[PDB]
Every structure is written in C-alpha cells, then in structure tokens.
Amino acid sequence: RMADLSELLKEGTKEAHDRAENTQFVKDFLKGNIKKELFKLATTALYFTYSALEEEMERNKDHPAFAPLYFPMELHRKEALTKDMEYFFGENWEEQVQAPKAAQKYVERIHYIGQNEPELLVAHAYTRYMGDLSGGQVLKKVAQRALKLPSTGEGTQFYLFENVDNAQQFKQLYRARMNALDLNMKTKERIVEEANKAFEYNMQIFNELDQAG
Amino acid sequence: ADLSELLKEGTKEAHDRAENTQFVKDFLKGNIKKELFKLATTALYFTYSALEEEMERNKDHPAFAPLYFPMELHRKEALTKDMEYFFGENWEEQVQAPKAAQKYVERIHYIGQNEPELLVAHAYTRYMGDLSGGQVLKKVAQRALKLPSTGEGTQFYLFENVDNAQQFKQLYRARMNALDLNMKTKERIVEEANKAFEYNMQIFNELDQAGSTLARET
Q: Which residues lie on this side of the membrane: Cytoplasmic (chain B)?
C-alpha cells in the first residue's frame, strides 16, 4: 500500500506542501492581512486557472486514466468563481480583468497536459480540489471577517461546496477512485512529478500576488 | 549557441537593471550603513545555504555534476563566519530570512528537488558574478564600514581556493557548455536565470525600503 498513488503523492509532495503552507502570502491571508483589491486580484487568478483545469477535465471526461475522477457537479469552481467575480466587479467584470502572468503560465501548462498528457491531469485535480475541500470553511471565514463580507455567502462561494455533504467522506471516495486507477509505477511517478510542478505553479501565483499588494 | 552565450545574451537586460539599483549604486559609491550591510549578509546566508544544499543534493546528477565545486565556490561557511561577526555567537536563534530572500530560497529548493537541470541557472548567475566582483566589493565594504584589514565580516567576498578567477570562469564555462541539453531545456535555463534576477530585484527592493525606514528614523 506504499504503492497506492495517494501514498506516493503524500510522500512525494511533502516538501512542496510544506513550502506552500508556510509561504508568506498564505500566512498573511490566514492572519486577515489581505485587503479587498488584493483579494479581488487573487480571485481573478482563481477564475482563470480553474476555467482552464475544468475545461481540460471536461475534454478528458471519458479518458480511462481520468474518467472516474470527473466530478463537475461536486467539485467544479468556475460558476462559483463567476458569481464571486460578479459580486466584486459587477456584471461586466470580464472586461475589467486579465489573467496575471503567473496564472497564464499555469493555464498554458494545464491545456498542454489535458491535450497531450491527460493521464497527468489527476496530478492537478487531486492537489487542487482535495486542498479546496479540506480548507474551504476556514478560508471562507477568514475572508468574510477580513473584508466584512456578508455571512450569506456573497463573495466567498468558491469556498463552499454546495453539493458535497461531507468533505472528509468525499476525499476518501476520491482517493479510493484514484488508487483503483489502472496505472503502472512509471506513470504514478510521472503523476507525483506533475503534482510537484502543480504546487510550484501556485507558489509563483502567490509570489506574483505578494509582489502586487 | 553555447549555454554561456545564450545566458549572457538572454539575461543582458536583467543584468543592467541589477547594476543600476539604488542599493548597488550607494554600495559602490561607499554609502553603505552597517545595519543594511548586516541585512544584506543575512539575505546572502540563507540564499547560499539553500543553493549549496541543492548543489550537494545533485552533485552526482548528470545535468549538474560537472558544475559541482564545493572547495572552490561554496560560500556558506564563509557567510557563517560573517554572521557570527555581525550578530554574535547565538545569531541563528534570532535571525530569520528576510521575506524576499525566503521566497528565493523556496524557488531554489523546488528546483534542486524537482528540476535539477535548471539549477545551473541559479549557480551560474550567482557564482560567476561573485567571482568577478569579489576583489572590488570586499575592500569597498571594508573601507566604508571600517572593517578589519585581516578579513572579518567580508569572508563571503574572498575566494581563497581560487588562484585565478579568470581561468576558473573559463573552466566553469566549458563544463557548462558540455552538458547534454536540448535547445528547449536551454531556453528553460535562460528563462529561469531571468527569474533569478527578478528574485534578485525583490531582495534589492526590500533592502532599499529598509534603508529608507532607517534614514527616516534618523
């Protein structure tokens, strides 16, 4: 069970996960130090990176190495992020925003993988959504308190999974699916490798955000 | 084109911006203040600590092995002496990495652990620079801060296991140019060297902001 993909990921991305937890921008957010404009900018980066990831997951919804992990209803953030974008910028928010450079680098990478190495898509989807599920409720409260956002959910719908009754149960089900995938040890290692890349793309988004505010 | 040539050409713009920063200008001009120099040496310590840990990790990796020169180039134990000098014996307990240096440390560890073939982008920009400008910066800092002529506080700027800096750069360039690399990975190396200079600028930016807050404090 050392060879379970979920175990290889946990062990393989330990240093990367450690760096993201302890990175200044994450900490500043957790302490309530991130102002409205920087949050709006952070949410913009979220919009473009999730759009891309979810387009490629939709492209590969029938692919043998990804199909079981296709959860548009449960997990997809694009339409929650659109409402958050609407809330902060108004109805023509699309013409008020652009993908920041570090976000557009991740977007490129995800279109590349979804179009060329779709057995590595799970590297992106696992590290992203399972993180989102784990942390949403604490992150939501942090943002609402910092920016005095309504308790009804406007501005923070990204952090709420309105079709997952129990995050812990769903994470267990997702892993069991990820572990049942017919993948050889070489492909798993390439997945762990791409999971590390996925983490670093985020570090660079945070780096660019920290340099902004 | 050789990697050294792609690097020199491809990081020219970024090289020129580094040289025309307010920190570098003032340093060279002599206008450097103890606490700001201490802050710079602190940034150097954690940076080179991270870099040399990753070079060590990849000393036998075919994409880095030939560029492994612990005896000639490694700076950590020199900087440890410089840290003891400015901060006393217990320093490690009291000094954290400055924010932008810490961000650069994070990148270095990612690279050395996951994309070691790009480590040369960091090693080459750093060490070739240090080796070229050591003899000038050493005595400018010694002169400005009134440091002892025996060498304390500037160990970082002295490469005592390099007889001829010019000849060693030649050696180092030939080895780097012999590495088995695609044009595609060469471009990724140049891109990463440019990113190192952005980190470099953030570290200088931070030191500049620290200098204003201690001149508004006087």
A: 1-218
Radius of gyration of chain B (CA): 17
Q: Is B36 helix (H, G, I), strand (E, B) or coil?
A: helix
Q: Are the beta carbons of A164 and A74 closer than 8 angstroms?
A: yes
Instruction: For residue B106, give the nearest of A23, A193, A197 by CB distance.
Output: A23
Whether A171 has a binding-site annotation, put simply, is: yes
- Say whether B124 counts as a known binding-site residue: yes
Do A24 and B113 count as a contact with CB atoms less than 8 A apart? no
Q: What is the resolution of this structure in A?
A: 2.4
For A151, half-sphere exposure in the C-beta direction (CA atoms, 13 angstrom radius) is 0
Q: What residue type is assigned to position A139 of the chain?
A: L
- The CA-to-CA distance between both ends of chain B, in Å, stands at 52
Ligand-binding annotation for B172, yes or no, is no
Q: Are A73 and A122 in contact (CB under 8 A)?
A: no
* Total Cβ atoms within 10 A of residue B172: 21
- Identify the residue whose tokens are 């999730």: A50
Contact B110 A203 (CB under 8 A): yes
Q: Scan for tokens 């979920």, then name that residue.
A: A6
Which structural technique was applied?
A: X-ray
Burial class of residue B176 in the structure, from the number of CB atoms within 10 Å of its CB (0-12 exposed, 13-18 middle, 19+ buried): buried
C-beta neighbour count of B54 within 10 angstroms: 21
In the 8-state DSSP scheme, what is residue A158? Answer: G
* CATH number of the CATH domain containing A116: 1.20.910.10
Amino acid at A203: M
Q: Which residues of B touch A211 (CB under 8 A)?
A: 202
| Residues in chain A within 8 Å Cβ distance of B110 | 16, 19, 196, 199-200, 203
Residue showing tokens 């308790």: A151
Chain B, nearest residue to A199 by Cα: B110
Which two three-digit tokens encode residue B88?
A: 């006393």
| A179, burial (CB in 10 Å: exposed 0-12, middle 13-18, buried 19+) | middle
Beta strands in B94-206, from DSSP E residues, in sequence order: none
Look at residue B115 and give its three-state secondary structure: coil
Buried b (16+ CB within 10 A) or exposed e, B17-39: ebeebebbebbeeeebeeebbbb
> B43 CB contacts (<8 Å, ≥6 apart)?
B97, B98, B100, B101, B203, B206, B207
Residue span of the structural domain in which B166 resides: 1-218
Distance from CA of A19 to the nearest CA of B (A): 7
